[PDB]
Amino acid sequence: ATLKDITRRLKSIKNIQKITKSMKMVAAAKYARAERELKPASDRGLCGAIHSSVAKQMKSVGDKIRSILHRTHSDQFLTFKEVGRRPPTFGDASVIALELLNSGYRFRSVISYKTQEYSLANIIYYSLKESTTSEQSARMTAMDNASKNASEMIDKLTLTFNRTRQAVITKELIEIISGAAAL
């Protein structure tokens, strides 16, 4: 590729590398907040294979879960959205309970994870809190890998950039020397 194509490509990944670095620390900040609230007791992606791991056990809350199963099995389960921005408080968690009875009808560590009114309000609050801390830990490492993978591509493109940089300087100069000799 020409020198300009390497420059545009190098500038592209440098931005993505810096942007993925920002999402790592934002995920790490919300991870700290999530773990404190979990000790007593989603929609947004970019968090490893959590949403697929939930679908693994169901075949054998969270609008992203609907997107996977909508084409295959839509009529089975009865809808929630906007989950991931803030951890689910007891006030917001009670809305899940209202759309069940009054109606017509897990985090381990930073780099690994595994998938009547008042009693039911406790079990739903436990599952969502564990899911909140799981996705923040996964998004932390996911964006951390994205930045580190971007860093490697920048390093190799920087070497390819400098090789092509020198070649252009040498080639253009040989044209001028070729021109002067022919006079």
Partner: protein, 159 residues
């Protein structure tokens, strides 16, 4: 470069050997989106040959188009249907490899000589999705498609 660039016009069939393909272990390292031929035409080779020929190159191009997405984000960020297209392309890449007769001396594996009709049949089954359950390493360095299925059963015996 001027020297190789000029020769292209003087050739009927071209065979572009890539280093990136060779370094991955895929031999012979013939680039499937660079090598070309003038007899590659439905009138000459037949409509079934030409249709299967473009199908291999199509899914290989789609697989190559998603490399930037797999590098930064990952395989999990890809769509469910896109995972199927990436899976088959890698099996197609490995099935394009082949043990050579002259390579026996250093490689060790016996050389293969696949007929034309068996080649077209083999790749067409992979594109249709008749061997999606089998692993990739079964396709690496085999003759026809029949020996790829038998090689998967051998790997199945690691317990």
């Amino acid at each position: 470069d001027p020297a190789p660039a000029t020769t292209f016009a003087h050739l009927d069939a071209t065979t572009v050997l890539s280093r990136a393909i060779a370094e991955l272990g895929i031999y012979p390292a013939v680039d499937p989106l660079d090598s070309t031929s003038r007899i590659m035409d439905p009138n000459i080779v037949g409509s079934e040959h030409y249709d299967v020929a473009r199908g291999v190159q199509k899914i290989l191009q789609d697989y190559k188009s998603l490399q930037d997405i797999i590098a930064i984000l990952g395989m999990d960020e890809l769509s469910e249907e896109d995972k199927l297209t990436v899976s088959r392309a890698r099996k197609i890449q490995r099935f394009l490899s082949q043990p050579f007769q002259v390579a026996e001396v250093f490689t060790g594996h016996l050389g293969k000589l696949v007929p034309l009709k068996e080649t077209i049949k083999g790749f067409q089954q992979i594109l249709a999705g008749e061997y999606d359950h089998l692993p990739e390493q079964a396709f690496y360095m085999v003759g026809p498609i029949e020996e790829a299925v038998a090689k998967a059963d051998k790997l199945a015996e690691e317990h």
